[PDB]
Symmetry: D2
Amino acid sequence: SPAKTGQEYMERLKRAKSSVYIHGEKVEDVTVHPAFCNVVRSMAALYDRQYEKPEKMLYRSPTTGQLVGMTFIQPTTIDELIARREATQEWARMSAGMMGRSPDYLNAEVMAMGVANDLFAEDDPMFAENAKNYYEYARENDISLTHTLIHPQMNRAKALHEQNDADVPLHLVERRKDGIIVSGIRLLATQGGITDEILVFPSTVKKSTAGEDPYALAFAIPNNTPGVKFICREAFDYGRSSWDHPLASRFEEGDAIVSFENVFVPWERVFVCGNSSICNRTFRETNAVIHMSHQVVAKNIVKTEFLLGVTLCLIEAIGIGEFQHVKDKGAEIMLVLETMKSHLYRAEHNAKRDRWGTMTPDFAALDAARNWYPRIYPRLSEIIRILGASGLMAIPTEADFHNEEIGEIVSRAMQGATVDGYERVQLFRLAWDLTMSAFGARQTHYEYYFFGDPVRMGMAYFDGYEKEPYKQFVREFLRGA
Amino acid sequence: SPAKTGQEYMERLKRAKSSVYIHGEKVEDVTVHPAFCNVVRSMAALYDRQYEKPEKMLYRSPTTGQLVGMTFIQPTTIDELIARREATQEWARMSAGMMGRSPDYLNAEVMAMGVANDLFAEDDPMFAENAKNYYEYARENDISLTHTLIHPQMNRAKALHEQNDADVPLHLVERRKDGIIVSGIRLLATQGGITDEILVFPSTVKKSTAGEDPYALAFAIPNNTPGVKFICREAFDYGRSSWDHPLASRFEEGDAIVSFENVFVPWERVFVCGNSSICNRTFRETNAVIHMSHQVVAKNIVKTEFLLGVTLCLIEAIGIGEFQHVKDKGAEIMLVLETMKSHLYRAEHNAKRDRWGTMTPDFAALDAARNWYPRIYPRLSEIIRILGASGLMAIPTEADFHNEEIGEIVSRAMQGATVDGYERVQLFRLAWDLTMSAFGARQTHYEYYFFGDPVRMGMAYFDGYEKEPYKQFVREFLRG
Amino acid sequence: SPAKTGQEYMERLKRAKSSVYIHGEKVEDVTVHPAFCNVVRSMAALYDRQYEKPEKMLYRSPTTGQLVGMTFIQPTTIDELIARREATQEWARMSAGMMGRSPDYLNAEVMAMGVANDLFAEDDPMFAENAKNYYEYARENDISLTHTLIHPQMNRAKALHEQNDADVPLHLVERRKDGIIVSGIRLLATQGGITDEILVFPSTVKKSTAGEDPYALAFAIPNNTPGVKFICREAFDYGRSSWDHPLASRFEEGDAIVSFENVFVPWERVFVCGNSSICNRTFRETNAVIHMSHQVVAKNIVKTEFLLGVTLCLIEAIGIGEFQHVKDKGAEIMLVLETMKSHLYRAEHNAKRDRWGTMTPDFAALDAARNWYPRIYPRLSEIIRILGASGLMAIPTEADFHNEEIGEIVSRAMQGATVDGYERVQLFRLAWDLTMSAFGARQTHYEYYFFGDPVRMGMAYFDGYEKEPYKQFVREFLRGAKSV
Amino acid sequence: SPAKTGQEYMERLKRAKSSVYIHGEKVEDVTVHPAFCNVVRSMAALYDRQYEKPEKMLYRSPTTGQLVGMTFIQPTTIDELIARREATQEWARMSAGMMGRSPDYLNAEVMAMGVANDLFAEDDPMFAENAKNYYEYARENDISLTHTLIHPQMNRAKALHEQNDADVPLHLVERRKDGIIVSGIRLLATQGGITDEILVFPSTVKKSTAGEDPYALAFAIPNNTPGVKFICREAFDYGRSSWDHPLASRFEEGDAIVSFENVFVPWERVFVCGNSSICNRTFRETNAVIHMSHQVVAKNIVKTEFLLGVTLCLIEAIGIGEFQHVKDKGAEIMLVLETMKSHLYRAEHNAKRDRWGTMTPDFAALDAARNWYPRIYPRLSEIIRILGASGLMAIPTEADFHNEEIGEIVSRAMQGATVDGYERVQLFRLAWDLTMSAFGARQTHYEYYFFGDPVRMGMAYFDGYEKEPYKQFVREFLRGAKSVF
């Protein structure tokens, strides 16, 4: 079976030896370096879950007949579509919705563009073939992927070609028989260099013009390709136990600058080569934004369930369940959860087959969800913070509980209404790690910016909305005077 | 009886002569008095639509075989449930979502109580039979209804029995062989005195204690019952044309104080008689809150499409649609629309049969919707006001355009980007009447307080929510 | 004595006979037409108050030495500046802060430009002289004024000269020996044609470009100037009693479209003639925006005192004063009140003399206040609406209480915790007329858009802020921790 | 000269040897432990500033005639009140407004209660004398103080005496000839065990009823009193350079649980002994909330000036200054700064003497300021987060710049519009440490909760407001339209 286990996943990262830098040093082994080993372990547990629950987490490849990841499926019926989502939710439950690049996110993108690959043939028929071959290769080899969609804009008032240093952003250096050469920088590769391969693709939102053709690239390459380096930001896993830092010590995915010094990309791994127009249409005409949104909305639901659980546990632990303002705050989170569930229900049950036979979720539902959820997420976090109150700062370590001189003092001190001190501090430390640690604050920031800047997403949502019917309804009504 | 036409509807009001008071005088005929005649004509037109499209607006009564209003249906399949909703939306589109008491709101309530009537039998088996017969009576005679759910709380820090005047709220005076006698006051009867009959029911939200048993009433009577008076608030229809006041001169429903002086109610029209515990459960255990929420969310969607339309039209007319803050304001309203359409989709397609055979909408979805939309409606209103800006105050009358001295001046002056002066003032008048007239401000207030105070609704929403799964998920996570 | 009484004020409007149109008809006499008569009587009452409280509302003219209106003063001391504001607040209290064009608002504008008129000499020295002459004329004859700053922007995605009809907005037609000819349209003359004269002036925010020179006018004319018509939007005084409509039947100021068909403006009435650059700087370099803002903040404080009053009264009548959400809403309004008073306190007591010797309020305070208050005002309105709840829709009329069949029923029905039926409906009717009548909704819209669009006002506020100090502070702090 | 230098301050802490625990172990020396050494140097530097700028930061003691700290002053004129505030702002500027328990906050409380001590005589006349004595002692020895006002609320829906464990909150155990015994816990000692003494006082907002008399204590004791332990929450200074963590590695003040095992307090250190009613009035009737509020608002202004500065630097660096949404977000911060400055101005210039002769700021201004700013602070933080966007996550370390293999790649990669890579990542790291580090989020959470829960503060503000005048105004207006039927 080509679908991989946790240890097969770790063994492939170890043998890859990608050029990865953190805290001023080259990383010898990502599987054991303190900044990465925990999140690698968490990913490994996802691959183990596929084998624990094969009937739900695997399916038969239409090309090879072997058991491959469910999250790669091309759904052709609403049942297959729901099945894909249930697999996404199983992993999302394991990571409390904290992972932005669990394999299922990229698996959806790669499938969509494999299957709906025709756009690419406008440039050359080979790029369309490459897309299909790439998806099959990814699925049949259980590749783990991230992407990078973000250029170093330096001056946002201006286009990439106008910057002081126009060569900083990733661009095409030349074309050859056997492939292409690229140089420059991409930003925010989440799980950069603890994945097998990386998709370099255009932005979801930021629409690029004719002068930016040298920057308009889509391709996928091994993380360890010669001349690629992953320069990680500072780790937010400070090496603590998962009682003390219950999230940061399990799900800290890293964000990385990606450098390309003179990187050779073989032709077979290229999808778009120096074409603003095709780039600008890639997410839309492959339907990839739809399947990517499906996964995200499903994951957001699991995550909202978790924040809700924390909120409710906090409420009970401190005995504040009877105040009106507390109940309304609880009601805010509950409404968000039901809203997201309602969009997902419509997305799946109102799905229709596209011209490639893919059962395609109703995007009117998912597009609203993905535009709304980021805007409201900071308030969900603000709610946990406000309810926890001064108790969020009363967070001694586990070690403080086991100390001979103070263990009892601390136990009695940190007592709640309905809980002993040890269980209460554990609970509050989870609320804290979710909202006020560097890991938690980053979760808020990441949800808000997940598919791009809400300011731009809002402009694009308005412009893409079918607005004529609503005018016609109002114009008829005025005519009847 | 044949389902009603518009003429039949107006004929019954005329013949009933309810005691109705407005602006300090008794009303002789509600069908011609200037405060009501326009809204009566809008109501009439809904009944006319029922006969123009019988396949969509009527169905065969399961008891008599006759065509009766679709919005009375007891849906037994998903398709019948969608069919009821489409009829509600036909009517809602004709009134741009403005009507709080189009018949379909109450028709849902009365169906739900008539079919799921067993609750009432806890006090006496006759009261459950009364609910069933009342449903059949309403459907087979195409009764138009409103209700009244709100007591005069005077001091809100206290229960009704503790007020300085304990007898002001409507309460039971005595019991008799043939019926009961009631006295006192109910508030906020929307369309009070332009309906055939009125439901007197408990609140949806506010819970009552043992000491408030004398106030715990559920019954239905004709509007013209002896001893019943409707004392109406000031009209927000100032008698202007429908170019000037395009909403207020068509859909001003009225809100009335209802007075009962020693009113006789026959036993056959009583559902709950002096029982807090039953009253507290009436909206939930009949499933009436669910079916009523179905109607409201469907109507809210039509309403939001209307607000969206107005907003977009303003944007085009003024030429502001390339500014990013304007686009984002447009986007706010669209997200609301898709949010409510998604809840409605889930409500209908995830519906299940209840013990009584009724295909019941998914209330997890409708409960969220009906709690959320009131909260967010003020913002939709605020968006129209902000976009319209100074242009909302440049609203000369139709007659100004007709005036020989100034007609041409005004036309040239009130020009827009993509519209003539006349068409532009008409559009801004619609935006104005929707948000800044007495009519429009009322629309915003009415949506906010529709099923009750959001403060109390939020508390009830929290307490009613199935919370255990979520806490268990986090506790499993903490365990390992 | 040249300061006017209420009757003198009314008799001037009657004898002036401006061309005023409302509800499809020419108005014969604004002082008795139903749409204007109440507000005219309210304005009359302000002029009467002058003479009832002369030691507070009048002062000796520096040029004639006779008693003139205090809100004309050019303050040269902090005392005289406070005195002006107390005068503003006397009138604001009589109107519950509801009037946008009480005479004091425009009186401050005309004073500031009369005194700091040197900008105008950039175009032509006579224009500076005119401004000074106009100020003295307005003060010495107690002229009541409004203004209009608003062009008919048809397509806001373009400039006035790029519109499909470029001749709709008010523009210069030609220049003659004795004056100028102007044609076109201006919007939003609040109190249009129930004042003696009108100021036609540039926007306080909207900047104009080279191509909009022909539209860049500043002048003052009598409201009855031949070729001038005031076309009023429909009145929001529907002729009710002040028990029923306590505000709309007293303070409905009107907003007029102003038409000019080949209107002649004498040169002595001109301040700016077809000059975008000078228009763009008119409010700033004259300090007019500062004195106008002083008047506005003082009036906004009065208005907030009233809203607070109404809110508290509602809370006690209904008996909800013990709910925490209710108390927090009360606290919001209180904080707004204290914020505005703080800004006024700093504005006055940190005033400094300008190069003309006018004691000039500290604009850092007033500018923040005038940017903030509009943005927060909708919420003050929302709070009254929310606390009032269902009771706001239970508004029978006075005539319902006086009807013999239903009077008693209504009285008993409408009781509150601490007030009887008649008192309760009267209070709720004031809350209603303040926030949910056409009058009330307009008040919310008027505050929000008072000095212009908050979107533009915020861009100007940011651009005009002295930002450099705060960058240097941060940059020094970073310089500490640098490596080499 | 009794005012202390930085090294006198560090020496005094080192010799006191309080019982302080963090990360599961007893701290030997708070001057050198990695969790405190940075903040201790930051406090030391405030005490050195005192001596660098004596004319502004010191004054002549009214009792001894020697030079003592200005923030202790009992102001008798508007000038002395302004001078106190300028000293507060000198220290606030060194800390970018980030320190919640710089000595000046406490010094204002202790002065207020020393001078306006009459309330305490209601229980026992010695307690009023003690408060006066305590003020002079703290001033004359330049005592650095913090306080704890928070009880372990376990079940917040119930009073302290109805808790599952009524003995957990700090309470009177017995009274003696010579003093009192207290046992139990207090919850949020900021700078616990890096000060000389701690004030144990009632809440500013939370009322206590009878039944909570055993819990209504006011006293001051040395941090090293036998039976007292400070149990610190985990450090948010993770031992990085001040280029990487520019705020967390200078101003991490620490929050401490304060434990008392049958601790002896001598009578001379007691101000309130088991009296709810007097505790409930302690902050008002001494005017201490006024002078504390003065300090906080002045500090809040310095802090807003710094957030503004960060916001504007970010906008220039990234080149986003011409977008309207960005300019409005700038304007939000400017309005807050002007609002706070206006309140402060009114507070000082409209100050009036109290019955003890202290020039007392106008509390109408300061009470609004202190209720409002906590509510608006999270928005200021969200603006920095929003504007910084993806750049906030592009934060390589200083050591990444200094690596030979990647240093130049990172410099080119992280350029801004108007700044090079190194200067840019430094700026964004300040923005990050201000809003999105453990340090940053704490700042936002501390500002919000500073003088108590806004929900309770808002109730108290409404209840305390002089409401009748506004009702009379409205009623007179209504009276005008009354029919005589």
